Symmetry: C4
Subunit: 404 residues, 4 copies
């Protein structure tokens, strides 16, 4: 995309400006050798004036009140080539400090980088990364200020920049070795305000990290606290340790399969067409694999499909017993069950991976002809008899059909 | 408002007192030149005694137990002109330390500033701002204490105040360069307690910042974790990547339109009259634009209106197909649909921006005469047939009407 | 209570031990003058062995497995008078370091102080207070260790204790001036481990403060984010600014009255008898103030009472209009309404503070005889006609009564 | 388990490598004496190449794309014996820095330790422990780097290692005494990057601690905020202080018994078979202790069992009064009730620990023959008459039975 590469170029240009403008403010001799870049950057600095208005016009233009509002005002203020003229005129420090207006583009750059990276990047991590980048740029600018308040000396420019950056990293990280310290009162005022800013931004870093790690394992923490709540309630209820262990291993299966998410709660997040499609292709060819739903309209299939209730049967659990009066049918999704007798010694069948059981109770109220026992965790779907008749009432033709 | 400007004046007076009272405690020669201000401030310091009781009387007076309770007791304690008399008498330091009772008005000032700014300002940000202001005032007071425990010298007052403020900012920000350090045991005790206080208040700043940034993007984080939960569940269910992409782009549309908020959940927050008005002017002239709801009572219109179910149909999704038995009507809110044949090759019509489809199924149970396909995201509202008859039962006159 | 004062005495004794045992470990000459206290404390140190087992026996004794388990094991280990014998024998430092076993009672003291103060004190604030007290005791112990690793000198004991406490407060608060620093390798190892411990406990303080302030305004933050969600949804729905302002002021009223809590959600937290009593005395003599519910059984009154639905009508809102078919009755709780004509020019009546309207629709289906308009926020309760007949079905005698 | 002990051995080997590789990088003379260990470790470093692929094959093998993907790539990169060859060749520092590739196994070790300890250990605490271990290893490596940038001297290796570790603990904990400080520009660059890393990881520690303590008392905080919400709502409703105290003590009982968890909300977390088993053995032999449910099928017992509604009756509360028409039966779970007359002076009976009352209303609509008053908190279960007939409709045989 041309918009993405243009935004990357604008970000690189603004990073170059943030690095250079204080650096050339304290080193005016650096202004001339990098003059061919600046004008190009300055061209970009005005080339982004319409293009941004163009790039927001393609994405739901609506209203674009430029030259006003909290948005696009710092962009236009930084867009004007103040830096070139002030560095050409070689104005004194109180007036040449206005060259930092060029750095006001950084807030718009951060907003644009948020907009182009709010999808594949966590907003907490994106905010932390933007804060860290702004902190590095601010550390460079603060080191440049420390240059500008250092006494003049014949120290090499690299060595004194290293010392200034070392001081501002000691200050900003709240470490403060104190080997290099303020000497003049103006340096002391500057160190006070830089200390306040560094404490503020280090608290910002710590808070952003705390926010990032507070929901780093939100699903696992939610599932574990649900398990703890259930276990505490059962221990209060004097539940036998065998059933507690069965519930614990069920929750372990739930966590290891679907991250402990309840299927019903996840499905209500979807709208009706998306829920319909999800539940149709969850039971894709599975629901129309049974005979009673054959030769039926796809509308009646979907009326079954939205009314299927998921239910997890742990290993060794009776789904339906023989002689039970029975009021439901079950469609195995990914588990496995065994159909046995009422005595559960002779295994009639083994059903897994999309087959079903209990359809006799769907067309008569006679008790179950056989017992169904869960071999392992089943993840099968239960359709109630009463819901089946409730949806059968408004399809009369298949209501007449299912007598056969 | 007179109350707001009076509270601003009281806040300014208390800030002046917080700046000056320790400053004139360590500089008694400052007491005389600022005497005309103090009495005026002292007048304000008693002028706020009834007016606050007046200003809380206008806002649900109820009970106003002054001269007692945790509220209004520090206000009255700071209201008395202790500072003027103690600075006039020039009492020694252990007894003149009681002039800080004037600064006890700061808690009431913070409470009042909270009350007048709990609407347009986030409570976390308001608490952080109050904490930062109190930290600056405490830093000034601690620097004044550092003056009061420094050995006497002919150093200029400004320079030594700068040194003291520099020390207390090193201490409070937990930086601690150590260039200036305790020398006397009393200074060491003072530095210990100031270090504990500064660590406490810096932890307060970091905690407030962490709280502020933990819910800085609460809507985006909630929507993203909902999307992650749905995507993880679908990937467990072996959902095809085409449907996963469709659900992802649906959630992107939901986030970019209504911040990922489910319409039903938002509407249950409103009470019945406000929900009625919201759903009436959401479908403003839209619901009475259809023929079957014409010449009807506005009560029956509102009975439709509260029972409309929102539903989002993604682009290329079938709302209703031709030959489907059909049990609902749809009112397009802001999307666009196309009415096509059962073969979906001949386009019958294009419907968008407030028009509707599917009204035949509202007065007969015959199948749909045409297929409706979503051009883009629809945001339309679905009214069920069964709900329509449920509300039609108790309006017999329009029940007789709608046969035509 | 004897238990509370005994626990306070035990806490004071353990604080005395935590202050003294390292202090007398580095100052053996302090052991003899405070000998009469120690034995008394030692007596308390064994007097708490049965009494705690007694004090937990009064509060649901159940099982009390002493001399084992993570509970009551540190209590018994600290209970034995190791300190007295080791300070009597004057054993060398590696063996006399075992006198700190007496300080193991601090975890049991913290647990007991939690149990006796988990009701009127926030658990986050209680945890933070316990952490701060333990940090102060640990700072004293660490300063004593710093004494024990300082080179011997004729410095006064108070001055060197002040220096040691100053060092451990610099270390624990992560300030670190560096004016006093390790000199010997053993001091350097000690400073490394103390730095790790101080960073750990300062992170603990910051985390506890962050937890405390994350839910310091949980109700206000929840209400404000609900308001923001509703407002964002309505702005997406192009809701008119008049209705948005009405909803905003409704939410302001809700926050200023019931802290933004929905009445239904609060009532479901209560069990059936408590909900019954709450809703009975909310409408105390209010529900039996109307004529149709006179001479009725209190059981039928309570069947009305649990089925009353609260609803807030904002000022200037129509509750019921004249000519509306009407299916409910309303009991004003604390608001005020005006009964006017269909034209709403002639005011029939003003109803407030426990009276009612709309009872004709409770015994006939004829339309409303007059319009009811909300003067201000009403907080009235709505009883539906269908619910009224649903509960009237199983009281036949008053079903026969209400025809009159 | 062989897998667990092999993972422990791998963790120990990688900890040995993390301790030694920088230590022998700055002390080449240490490479030869520990050569027999390294090769053994190197053997383990390749012995984990198939075994991990084996150990993930036993646990739902599925796909194992080794030699690629973000997983198993650092494991294989660290698996190759780069360290042995580079320390044998004695290559210079820029090329011998590649021996740290062996330390890339630490991320896989952390992941494996997470997987083997995500069950009995809190994920927040596990993350914090892994972070602290990685911080200690990084502190050792950073101290080794500080050695490598220190000027050469005849200082003892232990003493200078102690000084380097002291410096990196001052830096990483953001304490920064400044007694030992950078001297050379390369040391200053190293200190800058180490300061940034130490601030980052100390913010990580503080954030992890904040996350750990934000949900350290999640149940207690949730219950307390629910109690505060209910109390604030009732105080708004002018609820009498007697009923407020009764609700407060009910919530205290709820917290002290089931941690304030609502029974219904906990039960919906369970699936249908687990909920069936839980509610069956909660009423184990309790539900079939009553006469009307005798000689009945176990299916009808379970149909009762899933439809039992828990309800807490506080002490002195009327469950059912004599003369009340009555529409439910109650099964006492662990509380105690007294059956008295309508005048409640003559005590008919005392029922507790699994017995029941109110069964007459289960087979007739005549009013209650006696009043039932709660002696203490009851925790009994309520079965409605309407639900009883609703489940009785589809068992005709016991529907005929219960007339007797
Ligand atoms: C985003 C990152 C932004 C960084 C820019 C701020 C630091 C720039 C310092 C330039 C100092 C300089 O080069 O000269 C400032 C002179 C001395 O004048 C002075 O008053 C001292 C001014 C000190 C810095 C004021 C910054 C105001 C914004
Ligand atoms: C994006 C583009 C960034 C361009 C940055 C500058 C590149 C040129 C550079 O770096 O040229 C060396 C600098 C500038 O001054 P000069 O030596 O040319 O002055 C003349 C020599 N004289 C003092 C003896 C008279 O000298 C120095 O110290 C500057 C050293 C580098 C400072 C920034 C390092 C990166 C910071 C990130 C945060
Ligand atoms: C809200 C911000 C409040 C700031 C006020 C606290 C700092 C005031 C220091 C005044 C010290 C002074 O000017 O003289 C205190 C003398 C020496 O006496 C002494 O004992 C030393 C007392 C040190 C400060 C005690 C503050 C007690 C509250
Ligand atoms: C709101 C109103 C605030 C008014 C603050 C005071 C204004 C007057 C001022 O500032 O007058 C200079 C001060 C006071 O002492 P002086 O020089 O008049 O004493 C006599 C000269 N002598 C020592 C040679 C004998 O001198 C100083 O150092 C004080 C410098 C300013 C200290 C506070 C700065 C703001 C802090 C915020 C937190
Ligand atoms: C809860 C608060 C608890 C505080 C107790 C810990 C500090 C006690 C220091 C006693 C040092 C002493 O008086 O002598 C320790 C000697 C030297 O011996 C040594 O090894 C140095 C031992 C340094 C402290 C080890 C604490 C172990 C627990
Ligand atoms: C997980 C914990 C990992 C720790 C490993 C990082 C520290 C290793 C330092 C080795 C320094 C050395 O022994 O020599 C590095 C030389 C000097 O060369 C140089 O450039 C300086 C390199 C400084 C450290 C760079 C680490 C890159 C990864
Ligand atoms: N021999 C069999 N082969 C396959 N399925 C069977 C067999 N016997 C029983 N079943 C299934 O097991 C179910 C048990 O309950 P139903 O008798 O309701 O319906 C039964 C059939 O779905
Ligand atoms: N020619 C048309 N012009 C406008 N709307 C149409 C036309 N044909 C069909 N429709 C609408 O498309 C709907 C499809 O479902 P129904 O047949 O229930 O009701 C149909 C009408 O609402
Ligand atoms: N004159 C009146 N005095 C008191 N209440 C009235 C009067 N006229 C009407 N109302 C009440 O206002 C209500 C409006 O709706 P209804 O007619 O259903 O029932 C009406 C009465 O409860
Ligand atoms: N004498 C008694 N012994 C035991 N239980 C009784 C006695 N009298 C009443 N009850 C129980 O108390 C209940 C009160 O309500 P019911 O009359 O519906 O049903 C009653 C019986 O369950």
């Amino acid at each position: 995309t041309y918009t993405l590469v243009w935004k990357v170029w604008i970000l690189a240009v603004t990073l170059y400006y943030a690095i250079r403008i204080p650096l050339t403010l304290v080193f005016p001799s650096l202004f001339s050798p990098l003059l061919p870049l600046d004008i190009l950057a300055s061209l970009a600095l005005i080339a982004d004036i319409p293009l941004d208005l163009a790039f927001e016009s393609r994405r739901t233009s609506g209203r674009k009140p430029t030259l006003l509002a909290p948005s696009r005002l710092p962009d236009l203020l930084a867009a004007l080539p103040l830096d070139l003229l002030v560095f050409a005129l070689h104005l004194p420090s109180p007036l040449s400090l206005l060259s930092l207006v060029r750095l006001l583009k950084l807030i718009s750059v951060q907003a644009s980088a948020t907009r182009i990276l709010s999808y594949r990047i966590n907003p907490a991590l994106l905010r932390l990364l933007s804060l860290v980048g702004f902190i590095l740029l601010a550390a460079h600018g603060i080191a440049c200020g420390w240059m500008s308040l250092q006494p003049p000396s014949e120290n090499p420019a690299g060595t004194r920049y290293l010392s200034a950056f070392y001081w501002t990293i000691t200050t900003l990280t709240t470490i403060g070795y104190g080997d290099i310290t303020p000497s003049t009162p103006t340096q002391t005022v500057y160190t006070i305000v830089i200390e306040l800013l560094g404490a503020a931004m280090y608290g910002l870093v710590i808070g952003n990290i705390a926010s990032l790690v507070s929901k780093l394992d939100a699903a696992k923490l939610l599932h574990r606290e649900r398990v703890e709540r259930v276990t505490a309630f059962l221990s209060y209820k004097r539940i036998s340790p065998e059933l507690q262990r069965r519930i614990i291993e069920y929750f372990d299966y739930l966590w290891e399969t679907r991250r402990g998410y309840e299927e019903r709660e996840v499905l209500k997040e979807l709208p009706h067409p998306l829920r319909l499609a999800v539940a149709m292709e969850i039971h894709g060819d599975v629901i129309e694999k049974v005979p009673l739903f054959k030769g039926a309209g796809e509308e009646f299939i979907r009326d079954i499909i939205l009314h299927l209730e998921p239910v997890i049967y742990g290993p060794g659990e009776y789904i339906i017993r023989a002689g039970e009066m029975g009021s439901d049918v079950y469609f195995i999704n990914r588990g496995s069950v065994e159909v046995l007798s009422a005595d559960e010694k002779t295994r009639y069948a083994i059903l897994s991976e999309g087959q079903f059981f209990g359809e006799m109770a769907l067309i008569l109220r006679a008790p179950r002809t056989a017992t169904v026992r869960a071999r392992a965790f089943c993840d099968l779907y239960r359709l109630d008899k009463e819901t089946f008749d409730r949806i059968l009432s408004r399809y009369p033709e298949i209501a007449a059909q299912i007598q056969e």
